[PDB]
RNA sequence: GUGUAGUAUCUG
RNA sequence: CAGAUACUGACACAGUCCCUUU
């Protein structure tokens, strides 16, 4: 999520595990959040795939249903050679409306 | 912050970078790239009557401290 | 962004609109035109249409010394998208002009731009480095590139 | 203006070599990798020669190459680490005759960066893991395994990063069924960047670190790290586990050391030194390569020094502890980059500069005469080199790797220009001559007075292995002969050859039928003659001979049908046909063993229409298809093996058509308005055709590719197949009113070479415009001239005599009268700033020097030219630029001199006239307008001839850097800088002033340039880029020049020339690479073809990824973005895929695969 | 209609 | 330090609780 300047990416390593995407975000770029021309698959480090974190969506974290992908700009710019893009942060715009709507 | 990616990669400078550590990295990168291309080493081995192994050994040895000692 | 490869024919029409878009107007105009230029340069990469991209590059550079996060976030993206369609050789000349500036706010921005250029296409900068003469006691000249057959 | 990049010759520069069972059977193949080309080749164990099986391209440089096999397997895999930034595992498929992608893992960015794995690659000998490491901080380890699917698997990579560490070499330690262990040579430099005094730069040792792979906890940790005494360069693995000890064989400078982890001593045996070395006694001795011949009975090792001397390392041990190392000098070979000890006593040597050899081992070196060294001897060993006495040469592979200069010109009495390349380096340099065609070999020459026109050679029996029958036919007379290595006149043939012979058929297994104008006479091996006389005044025209049937035609189109029977009796049909024209050209296909006979017969007529008549008697004498031709055909022939047909026309053109009763694909090409005949020949056990014209032509079908290549020989009119014991495969052909024998040995290729030996490395040469001679010059660093070497040897062999011992020193007498050669034993490299130059004049026709001029010490020749001045008449002066005390790395000189010769007596003499001293080294000499332009470093000057020296007329100082090139045209001259691309300066003769007006923006490391017509300079680059710079039309002859072309060949280019290559061709842009490749940059003609080619290239960019895996557009944009260039190798690669993928690629453009292939070959066959 | 970051201008 | 008026980021909207255990 490039809109929130609070989220922190992982950038540990690649692997043989393929990321998954949920219904809320099916054809969105992992970094660009675009909608055009998926090009390459997404790999995640073993630290991001273990037990309760297995088969979860990369951006939000819901039950994944379809494979993730990279847009053509990310392939031309070689932005996929960084590691895994899994978000390791809870966020501030998604963990506050909970307590705001509790009342 | 967008400085996370720029920090984990060596050779990245900042606002308090002195010329010496810029030039030593500039020379080290060239030395590393010399051994990559085969024709870039053929040219060096033909320019001076030496062998490829000797040129590679000299290039590896010169990487310990190029551009002299610091200040 | 949508047309992609087909933008090499309508490249001339938008230029005398970005030209007066990159003026001293509100920040929104220059913020949006930076993304426009980024997509425009990324869509035509590899087809040899850098003649107009070089002219367009002369307007993005003045709008780098800003403070709002959005405008700089767009301008750095535009510069990164232009550096792959034009080449690191042209960007290095612009960046090296004020690297060792005697101020600090300009030096920080120039070093950030240099780091952005340095991370990508690392090996492509070997042949584009300038020549620096020797000081009192140091070796600053790559003598291995002066060999003549 | 768009350009199309084709290729003519592929690079032959070997960098890596591996061996193993890459096929699956019990035969070992060699996988040799070029600079960016993956190649496979295997040697024949029965004859020793080596063939080629695959030359696939990977589109990217290769930095490592390793081979491994799984446990309990029988197939070898290939692991490739390259600039792609990934790791690739390949597999050879004999059925598909092509590689197979298996795995692909990404672990970083792309480019030869510092922290990027891919440089050093090591594999576990047992085949359980693989380690790929960078030059610094980026060690990575994978875990290979096999699963229930019998397929290779790759696990997640394991990081082993370590900051501030330089890696020299990585090798895999051999352990027997334990955890994998790897070794590396680290050297920290953190403390060297914090002490301004510089004392930390020295006294810094490097350690031998062993890395432990925990196979139960899935992590890698380092255990042992001990400092060393002196620096090393590479390591050799030792077979351990259950067969021999485990350890390393670190090869430091002037020493070899064995070290093992745990508790074990060390062994240091000094390297043997050559006896009475003529070089400076302060140069270290190091190894360059190694080998391994591990065998269950006994194992040894190999090594090679700087001078190219093979040793034999044997270890001594009792149970685990190694006691001593026993060296022994094996042989002497040219310096190589890799060796492969092959089974069955074969050794493969791949030289780094020159041809590639292949030796066989007769003796293993047991109970020799020379002693063996050991570490037990206290305290500078010596040995005496000698001829081989242990190996023999059985094969040599040509390779024009180090090409420094090229020039295409026509000097002989023909129309096809030849290539005069100046390749080679060192004492084994040569200047080869390249011409299109094949190599011609002859065995014997015989004189046959008269006027023969044809000859036949058919086996007596179908089971015969030696050809016997020869029927030499004159215009009317005949003369039967035979081949038995004693070819003479034969009489007992009993053929009654008193009539002209038109054919010699093979009707049955051994039945032969002769043709005479009065009928048909059968001639069986047994006394069974079936003669059929034909009364009348009209004779026979031709006859369609075949292995099972005969078809004949008479004057006016009177068909006669013949068919044989198993009993052995002839037959004839009772139907006769009528024709609308006359019989001119015939053809007949072969019969496969799987069918009773052929399918159809081809008949040609005057109306230029081919007629197809079936052989079935039910519908015999009935045409099926009709097709006219633009011109009258002359001869016809059919080739087999998917089958195609060849159509020969009256003029010099040959047409190729696929085998089909109805008309189909047409392939038109030029064969010179003369009749062309096509016969059946044999090659390597395969069928081929042979066309004869003003020049001989040979066409062969091999792996779905057709090459129409001529023969480098004079005019020929007839040829025939040949096979015997003396020659492996030859050709029986006749000559102009005489007899000859032709032989072919080399595999099908182009650019035949004839080598002229030289003495040093040629720098530049020029061609005399009147006597077509050469002014070749030479210059090499670290060398001694013919006089200094002799005087140094004489002085050295005098002080050692008076060594206070026995007055009885007679070895000087035996030493001064025997000098070893230099082309096999290397050269005595001495000094650090020594030079030697030689000026040579050579006849391009045959190799024989005309004059030799030897310069004195520390004089390097850098430029030569031939000029003619104005104040003097026809006086061809020769100017040579000579430096003085040139040191390379700390560049500093003390001036130079320019020589001047006269070149009298039409090109075989040279007298010294005078020399002019200069304060800087000259590099560019260019004559123009009866004067000479001299570029002395930064300064630029113009000189004029005087009486004792040269006069300086004009001076200009505006070049930013060192001048390394000058070319002149009209009033505009171009100065090639070393960092700036180009500088345009104009010379005016009114006030004698040089002014610069136009320059370039992007700096370039230009090495050569060539103006195309008037304003575009086709330059080059030191890194591989090729660019074209054009000046704007509105320039006032501050004003930059635009760039219209950019590309990245990937190899250094030092030759550019625009000259037609074939008669009737066009203007090309032939260049030459630094590895041995020749390419062209031909442009497009029409506009509807450029779009098709661009679409094909764009579609293949995604439908056919590179073998290693890398963006082709990014690869071609390595330094500068591509511009107005379309790759042609990728387009030509379309011919090699699967049929379904071919159809899928073709269907978008609404074309058939034959339609795409035909024009792809047509564009190539037109410009070259 | 509401909430989650960021930015510009006048006045006190 | 505060108030007011405009603006940007294809920002998100009972989001739902998925080792918290006897
Ligand atoms: Zn989601
Ligand atoms: Zn993206
Ligand atoms: Zn992760």
Swiss-Prot record, chain A:
Zn(2+) 2 binds at residues 22, 25, 57, 60. Zn(2+) 1 binds at residues 10, 45, 48, 84. Keywords: Acetylation, Activator, DNA-binding, Metal-binding, mRNA processing, mRNA splicing, Nucleus, Phosphoprotein, RNA-binding, Spliceosome, Transcription, Transcription regulation, Zinc. The record marks 16 as: Interaction with SF3B3. One of its GO terms (molecular function) is zinc ion binding. Component of the 17S U2 SnRNP complex of the spliceosome, a large ribonucleoprotein complex that removes introns from transcribed pre-mRNAs. The 17S U2 SnRNP complex (1) directly participates in early spliceosome assembly and (2) mediates recognition of the intron branch site during pre-mRNA splicing by promoting the selection of the pre-mRNA branch-site adenosine, the nucleophile for the first step of splicing. Belongs to the PHF5 family. This is PHD finger-like domain-containing protein 5A. It comes from Homo sapiens (Human). The gene is PHF5A.
Curated annotation (Swiss-Prot), chain B:
Component of the 17S U2 SnRNP complex of the spliceosome, a large ribonucleoprotein complex that removes introns from transcribed pre-mRNAs. The 17S U2 SnRNP complex (1) directly participates in early spliceosome assembly and (2) mediates recognition of the intron branch site during pre-mRNA splicing by promoting the selection of the pre-mRNA branch-site adenosine, the nucleophile for the first step of splicing. The modification N6-acetyllysine is found at residue 8. The gene is SF3B5. Component of the 17S U2 SnRNP complex, a ribonucleoprotein complex that contains small nuclear RNA (snRNA) U2 and a number of specific proteins. Part of the SF3B subcomplex of the 17S U2 SnRNP complex. SF3B associates with the splicing subcomplex SF3A and a 12S RNA unit to form the U2 small nuclear ribonucleoproteins complex (U2 snRNP). Within the SF3B subcomplex, interacts directly with SF3B1 (via HEAT domain) and SF3B3. Component of the minor spliceosome, which splices U12-type introns. Keywords: Acetylation, mRNA processing, mRNA splicing, Nucleus, Phosphoprotein, RNA-binding, Spliceosome. This is Splicing factor 3B subunit 5. It comes from Homo sapiens. Its main location: nucleus. The chain holds residues 10 to 80 of 86 of the full protein. GO terms for cellular component: nucleoplasm; nucleus; precatalytic spliceosome; SAGA complex; spliceosomal complex; U12-type spliceosomal complex; U2 snRNP; U2-type precatalytic spliceosome. One of its GO terms (molecular function) is RNA binding.
From Swiss-Prot, chain C:
Residues 93-149 are annotated as: Interaction with SF3B3 and SF3B5. HEAT repeats lie at residues 8-46. Transmembrane segments: none annotated. It comes from the Eukaryota. It is found in: Nucleus; Nucleus speckle. Phosphorylated. Phosphorylation occurs concomitantly with the splicing catalytic steps. The record marks 50 as: Interaction with SF3B3. Residues 1-2 are annotated as: Interaction with PHF5A. Component of the 17S U2 SnRNP complex of the spliceosome, a large ribonucleoprotein complex that removes introns from transcribed pre-mRNAs. The 17S U2 SnRNP complex (1) directly participates in early spliceosome assembly and (2) mediates recognition of the intron branch site during pre-mRNA splicing by promoting the selection of the pre-mRNA branch-site adenosine, the nucleophile for the first step of splicing. Belongs to the SF3B1 family. Component of the 17S U2 SnRNP complex, a ribonucleoprotein complex that contains small nuclear RNA (snRNA) U2 and a number of specific proteins. Part of the SF3B subcomplex of the 17S U2 SnRNP complex. SF3B associates with the splicing subcomplex SF3A and a 12S RNA unit to form the U2 small nuclear ribonucleoproteins complex (U2 snRNP). Within the SF3B complex, interacts directly (via HEAT domain) with SF3B3, SF3B5, SF3B6 and (via HEAT domain) with PHF5A. The SF3B subcomplex interacts with U2AF2. Identified in the spliceosome C complex. This is Splicing factor 3B subunit 1. The gene is SF3B1. The chain holds residues 1156 to 1304 of 1304 of the full protein.
From Swiss-Prot, chain D:
Keywords: mRNA processing, mRNA splicing, Nucleus, Phosphoprotein, Spliceosome. SUPFAM superfamilies: WD40 repeat-like. One of its GO terms (molecular function) is U2 snRNA binding. One of its GO terms (biological process) is RNA splicing. Its main location: nucleus. The record marks 961, 1123 as: Interaction with SF3B1. The record marks 284, 306, 352, 425, 889 as: Interaction with SF3B5. Residues 1001-1022 are annotated as: Interaction with SF3B1. Belongs to the RSE1 family. PANTHER family: DNA REPAIR/RNA PROCESSING CPSF FAMILY (PTHR10644). The core of the protein consists of three beta-propeller domains. This is Splicing factor 3B subunit 3. The lineage of its organism: Eukaryota, Metazoa, Chordata, Craniata, Vertebrata.
